[PDB]
């Protein structure tokens, strides 16, 4: 997921700019985004939200707008219990479990329902589960007493001022997510939001693993106030951003650093290449227009190449295998951009899979390790060119095996297919540096692959008066069997031909294709 907010001073016209760019599975039902527009005499809200939710999580209007990305807030703890004498050892004593016998119905193949027993055991920590390996684990989830999640979002997005907005967020009712803001007044903000338990010891890594469940030492009971969490407002840099990367580079120059917050809030791992492209695309550009802003969103740079090809290519050329040499020349001639016509792209990915692991996040193969001091230009180079070439030797086999040649056009193997619409693909894996994302699936018997995760709801808004906005939903606004609105946008996505979002009554009336009156 990506997110950008631009201060008026960084723009040409002086109105704030906002990017909504959440990344989620294209098939998982509860992850499907829906686009809508609500209007009453007292408020207005345009935007996308997960199906089933009565509020718009990614919203905007004539006054303000927000967006969301994943920050992973560790709002829960998995304690390892020490079973003993029918109970569990705690603070030196064998304490008993809270046992509740419940039940539920299981539908049978013939349609009838069988009744099934279900015992619910609890420790002072919380519900207890048993893993396949036999380990007894108790899970303690924070914020179980925050019934106002939906209303917080509702007040947040209908806020008349940044102050009211912050007042809403302060209720600490939304358990997670990074949230970005921008309004017609000119204020932009970034927020590492969520409900985090107060702890006196242990880094985030410690709390993400099995914490000892035999001592009141690790039994937290309180949570942090909004003021204890990393936040940025109207920074000197003129913008804020987050691409699922740790909150240590929300803007450039930064306004704080890891040492200013407890070590259990966020990780301190190397920022992804896509996240690096994020900071670069914003800080390196000034006097932005909405048009230019959208253009930057389409970036599909193979940053991983820029970091490794200079060291790989030469070494691969001295290898006796003439095919390895040809592969080296193919890669070296590539403009390092994931375009439909790239004959080198596929081969490059296959190499990266081996050089940096299947998720492309591996670091052990770079010559220069990542550093928070050079956040957008590290890691760099190949540590073992010799080994790296063997990996390339293998990639050549893997590429031919998967696509039928080492030089097959990216957009010939990468397609976006919905219903009967089949169009060429572009952009790709975010971890290789592509800002616009399309996590291509494995290829079928014929080397054809499609997006499994990636771009979904994409909008860019300029808070002018009246506001101007464009957007697109990769998988349409409906998934009901037989709808004409499932694959009728994918064609425009393939060309980055965005729809102008309609908020004004006149506009809406001009494009209406169906009126549905109703009474409540």
């Amino acid at each position: 997921s990506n997110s950008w907010a631009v201060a008026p001073g960084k723009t040409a016209n002086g109105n704030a700019l906002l990017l909504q760019n959440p990344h989620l599975s294209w098939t998982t039902d509860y992850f499907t985004y829906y686009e809508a527009h609500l209007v009453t005499p007292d408020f207005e809200i345009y935007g996308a939200t997960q199906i089933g939710l009565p509020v718009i999580r990614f919203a905007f209007n004539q006054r303000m707008g927000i967006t969301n990305t994943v920050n992973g807030m560790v709002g829960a703890t998995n304690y390892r219990l020490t079973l003993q004498d029918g109970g569990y050892l705690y603070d030196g004593q064998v304490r008993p479990f809270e046992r509740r016998q419940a039940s539920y119905r299981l539908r049978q193949a013939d349609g009838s329902t069988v009744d099934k027993p279900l015992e619910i055991r609890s420790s002072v920590h919380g519900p207890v589960f048993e893993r396949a390996d036999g380990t007894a684990v108790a899970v303690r989830v924070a914020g179980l007493d925050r019934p106002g999640m939906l209303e917080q979002y509702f007040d947040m997005i209908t806020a008349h001022s940044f102050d009211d907005y912050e007042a809403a967020m302060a209720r600490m009712q939304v358990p997670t997510f990074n949230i970005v803001y921008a309004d017609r007044e000119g204020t932009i903000n970034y927020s590492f939001n969520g409900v985090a338990p107060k702890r006196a010891e242990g880094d985030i890594a410690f709390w993400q693993g099995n914490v000892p469940g035999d001592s009141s030492r690790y039994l937290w009971t309180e949570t942090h106030p909004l003021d204890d969490l990393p936040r940025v407002t109207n920074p000197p840099g003129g913008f804020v951003q987050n691409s699922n990367d740790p909150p240590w580079t929300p803007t450039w120059p930064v306004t704080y650093c890891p040492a200013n917050h407890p070590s259990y809030l966020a990780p301190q791992t190397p920022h992804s290449l896509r996240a690096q492209q994020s900071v670069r695309l914003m800080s390196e550009n000034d006097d932005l227009t909405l048009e230019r802003f959208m253009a930057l969103q389409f970036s599909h740079r193979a940053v991983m190449a820029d970091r490794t090809l200079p060291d790989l290519i030469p070494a691969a050329l001295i290898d006796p295998d003439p095919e390895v040499q040809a592969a080296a020349r193919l890669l070296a001639a590539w403009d390092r951009d994931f375009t439909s016509d790239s004959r080198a792209a596929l081969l490059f990915e296959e190499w990266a899979r081996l050089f940096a692991g299947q998720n492309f996040a591996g670091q052990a193969a770079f010559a220069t390790p990542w550093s928070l001091d050079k956040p957008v230009s590290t890691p760099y180079g190949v540590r073992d060119p010799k080994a790296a070439v063997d990996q390339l030797r293998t990639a050549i086999a893997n590429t031919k095996r998967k696509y039928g040649a080492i030089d097959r056009p990216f957009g010939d193997a990468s397609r976006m297919i919905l219903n009967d619409v089949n169009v060429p693909g572009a952009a790709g894996y975010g971890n290789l540096g592509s800002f616009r994302v399309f996590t291509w699936s494995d290829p079928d018997e014929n080397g054809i692959r499609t997006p499994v995760h990636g771009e979904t709801w994409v909008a860019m808004i300029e808070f002018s008066t009246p506001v101007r906005a464009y957007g697109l939903m990769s998988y349409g606004n409906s998934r009901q069997p037989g709808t004409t609105h499932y694959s009728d946008q994918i064609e425009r996505v393939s060309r980055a031909d965005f729809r102008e979002l309609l908020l004004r009554r006149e506009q809406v009336e001009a494009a209406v294709q169906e009126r549905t009156p109703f009474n409540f």
Binding site: D29, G52, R107, T465, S478, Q480
Partner: protein, 152 residues
């Protein structure tokens, strides 16, 4: 200087555009949530009802074995019951909105039974609590505390 004059809707209606994007207009808050509920039912009704169904902790009851794991996960963490609590703890204003949303979903299914997959018809009718439950499941037991990290 000042935001353009807000529109004052003088009647309830959804104006759909060429891409299936609903523009809900309500004379008041509850009306708008009802329209929203109706719109979402029209566009994703099947999956919404299925998800709401699981949120009640009845996935295994309604659709069998392939939903039993989730059922157990949500029951042991008492999500469906906490959902009833959270629903009751809502403010009177917002609870009215939530109720309207569920009513909208119900209304659409009532006027268009043919657009509802047989298998999820048993979920109807839905309630504000169902809306709350699903949200609670999504936020706390999918995003924050996933069954994966607790089980392996």
């Amino acid at each position: 200087q000042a935001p353009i004059a807000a529109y004052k809707p003088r009647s309830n209606e959804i104006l759909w555009d060429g891409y299936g994007v609903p523009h809900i207009y309500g004379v008041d808050a509850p009306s708008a949530f009802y329209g929203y509920g109706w719109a979402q039912a029209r566009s994703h009704g099947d999956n919404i009802l299925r998800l709401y169904g699981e949120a009640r902790g009845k996935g295994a009851e309604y659709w069998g074995p392939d939903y039993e794991q989730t059922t157990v996960w949500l029951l042991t963490n008492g999500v469906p019951e906490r959902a009833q609590q959270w629903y009751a703890q809502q403010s009177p204003d917002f609870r009215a909105n939530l109720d309207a949303f569920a009513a909208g979903i119900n209304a659409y299914a009532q006027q268009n039974p043919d657009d509802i997959s047989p298998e999820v018809r048993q979920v109807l009718p839905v309630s504000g609590a169902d809306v709350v439950a699903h949200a609670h499941r999504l936020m706390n037991f999918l995003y924050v505390a996933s069954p994966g990290r607790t089980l392996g």
